[PDB]
Amino acid sequence: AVDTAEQVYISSLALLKMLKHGRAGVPMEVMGLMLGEFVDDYTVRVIDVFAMPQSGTGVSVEAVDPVFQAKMLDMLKQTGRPEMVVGWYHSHPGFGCWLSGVDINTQQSFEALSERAVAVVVDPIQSVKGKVVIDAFRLINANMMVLGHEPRQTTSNLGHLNKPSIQALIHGLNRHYYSITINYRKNELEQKMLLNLHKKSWMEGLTLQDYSEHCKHNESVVKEMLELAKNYNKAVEEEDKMTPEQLAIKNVGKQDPKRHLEEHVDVLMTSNIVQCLAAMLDTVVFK
Amino acid sequence: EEKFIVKATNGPRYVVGCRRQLDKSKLKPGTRVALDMTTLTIMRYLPREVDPLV
């Protein structure tokens, strides 16, 4: 009878594999298996994550083929992947990320070997593209109902675990079903390779190609955007002619939610492209 | 011209975008089209017909 404060390490491998698996996350139930290595009690690291073929039955213990699982795991053992399985993941579209009776039964059956048995449910269907916040699930012991529910130390990270604060699922089904915190990790090779890879993904090939395109489109296409920009500017100035009357009458309180200032600041920012690219044309013409 | 309003058979209405493959030929209004559950993209249209016309 002892418990610690565990935290699931999530690298970009399992993340991107759950993003491609979320793209393949059809309404039909899907299956997946997580791998890794157990170094101590209160830490768990995932490295290898793959997908499983779909079945008409869906998420179930019968769909997990032991000769296929052990066959692929053996083919990972003959390669440079000497990691044992650490858990299984799946997708729950529509009805929420909670776990049904079948999922908790195959979780109870799959947790006999690994005491941790990390469970992750990805649901990118109804989640907006602004946040990719994912949560890992855990199974509590049925004999711990007499004593405290979760005797987990280091209660600081629970404030970060309070971000999924839906008022129906977390404490709507929190009995006999709790969760765990999630952190990330990134080395310098992922930082510089993925950082320079994304900057290059927003940059050009030689980085000098599409500059003169806009530098010379300022004279052909942007002129229409400058004339229309002046049409919006005058289209606001026609009301700014009426503003000094109200400002000359009341001077107390603000009733119009429009600021008429920051939009024109943005118009000036779009208009400064001519100034910033004029020096570019000066460099291209010079040398 | 790029994004228009669609009317589903079930009753609720939505708005969709334009796919990079198709053009504005069949995109004109008055032509029944098809949509996708993910991203509400447009694969192709749906030509109308009738029962005795079959």
Partner: protein, 63 residues
């Protein structure tokens, strides 16, 4: 890039979109009912002609 499609109507009065798919079809492609369909993929897998209005189907069932 050949044109081939079909119009589907579920029992719950919901219309979806899908092309003509499945196995080798000989007596299929007719406007009938009782076809094979999965949970949400809505594909055609097993088509078999169906009755209903049993008042005419079971007119005189004699072996």
């Amino acid at each position: 890039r050949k044109g081939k499609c079909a119009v589907i109507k579920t029992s719950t009065r919901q219309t979806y979109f899908l092309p003509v798919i499945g196995l080798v079809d000989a007596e299929k492609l007719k406007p009938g009912d009782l076809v094979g369909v999965n949970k949400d993929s809505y594909l055609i897998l097993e088509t078999l002609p169906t009755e209903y209005d049993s008042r005419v189907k079971a007119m005189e069932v004699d072996e």
